[PDB]
Ligand binder design. Sequence first.
Ligand code: ADP
Ligand code: ADP
Lengths: 67, 487, 62
Amino acid sequence: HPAAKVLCELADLQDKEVGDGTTSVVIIAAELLKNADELVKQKIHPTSVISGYRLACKEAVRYINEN
Amino acid sequence: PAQIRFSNISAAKAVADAIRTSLGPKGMDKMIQDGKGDVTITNDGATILKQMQVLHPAARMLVELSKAQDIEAGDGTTSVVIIAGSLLDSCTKLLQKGIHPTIISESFQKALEKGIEILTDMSRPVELSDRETLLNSATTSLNSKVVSQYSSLLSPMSVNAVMKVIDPATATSVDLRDIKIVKKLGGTIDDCELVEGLVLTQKVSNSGITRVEKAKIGLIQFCLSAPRAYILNLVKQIKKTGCNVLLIQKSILRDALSDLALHFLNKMKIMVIKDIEREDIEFICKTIGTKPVAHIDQFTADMLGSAELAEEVNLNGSGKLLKITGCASPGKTVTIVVRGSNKLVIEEAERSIHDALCVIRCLVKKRALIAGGGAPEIELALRLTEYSRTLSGMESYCVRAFADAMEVIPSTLAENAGLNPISTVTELRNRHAQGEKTAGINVRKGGISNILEELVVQPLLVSVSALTLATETVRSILKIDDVVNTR
Amino acid sequence: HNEAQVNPERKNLKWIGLDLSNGKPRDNKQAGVFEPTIVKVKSLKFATEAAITILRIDDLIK
Ligand SMILES: Nc1ncnc2c1ncn2[C@@H]1O[C@H](COP(=O)(O)OP(=O)(O)O)[C@@H](O)[C@H]1O
Ligand SMILES: Nc1ncnc2c1ncn2[C@@H]1O[C@H](COP(=O)(O)OP(=O)(O)O)[C@@H](O)[C@H]1O
């Protein structure tokens, strides 16, 4: 599947970047996709979901860097 | 008749809808697996349309709209298609209401002229050259991408190329012919430089001399061929004329310069240049002023070119280029020396440069400007509705339908921003009626407000051309009554 | 980890890992299971990017 192609490509480039984490990144991405699909089923436009995800990641890296 | 008009309307609306959601900076990207294993991944409307299969005539006309809008201004390629689809959907109601298509077409023409004049008279024009506002528009177009950090390296060079030659073409408008472009692989993006005249990027390997101030230039497309009758004559002609730089064209045979011919051409160490793209051949010819003659006999004393300097210097360390200045009529296509080791810093740099040159020429063809973000479309949807109320006759309803169909662009722009489209577009309409012209949407800041915070700004000509072409094509489609096969 | 926020004095209750041996919660900094910060941060970044890219590719009909 082309979506599977993209997901595997991102996993592979992450592996080439740092190594460990391909399975974790794939699992997390799939969970985010499932939850975002459930959200958009409730008449929330995906662009708001994408902006929210970006904000959440930006805040999560900050939280990690302080704890 | 109507049985084929309905088919054309449906086909055109379907092919417009397939790119409906790709409009805007927040445009959603597409993936159509129509082909033989094509991984379609992009959000550009023009490439989706041109890669989409075309079977109905109406789809072909809409793709032609996209291409014409692209060549004319280079922006709003999806905008014209969406507008045409909206117009066709709107006039479907008129057609089923019993209005003959000629009335609809005439009313659309009146709406076009009224919209053009309302859009330009009360717009915000630029009076002085004002390169600052051109730079600002470029930044609004050249930033927020990979080339965002390279805006201060690319836009000022293009602006300098513009100011170097204010070409008096199409009402003293700077056309596509400022100073001929060149590009070479390798180097870095910081290696960009502006040239003056003809520049050669082809590989040259001469161990002798190729640098003479009186650089006579010839074009002998007739090369060596496998049978002495027409082999060594060109060498004698070159020696008599004294040309030092003569590019070689392989339009006759692959063996352009054999070992014996090269050694005979090594006695004066003439410059050897191969693999010239055909589209640039006539540009080079008019740059030098010589004629593209493939006959050695026609080559005479009048065939000698004009040049001042010609050096095979390794520019930027390892970039071998031949700069020529002081020619007859150089300036074929705005120069941007695309140098870069990375692959993206070449293709994206060239695409951004093309967009910048289109928008700069767009603003110099006509010096008026409007604020984007759906402001012109709501302005049209209001003023044309007012006109149709003032306009008499039965074409008034057609004009009103035209104005109403012009509301799709702000609606889809806001929908791609996640806002409730209906509520925000009608709020924008109210704010525009009771307020000012510049009211638009703030797509990437989460809200709706004036343009002064936003200042997206676009030239008037993109919207003008998109509107005009969309109206002309909907006119043509409506006047269609039948299509016949079996020529 | 709820008490790591509501309670301002239980600050040093944040690295309660998963003890896979006995299957019970366990202080993990003391235990010694460790992960480079760059790995977690960049994996989160790539998970978000992949989710965003797949979620953008939606407006199709087939
Ligand atoms: N001793 C341990 N106790 C609990 N979890 C562990 C331990 N060692 C490793 N892990 C888990 O392994 C995961 C990372 O491994 P993994 O991503 O599967 O490797 P790879 O990316 O090579 O497949 C982390 O989420 C971490 O929680
Ligand atoms: N940052 C922005 N804020 C508000 N509106 C924008 C912004 N960028 C672009 N727009 C609007 O969205 C439209 C996008 O044009 P579009 O048809 O996508 O061009 P292309 O087809 O070349 O991508 C423009 O008409 C412009 O008015």
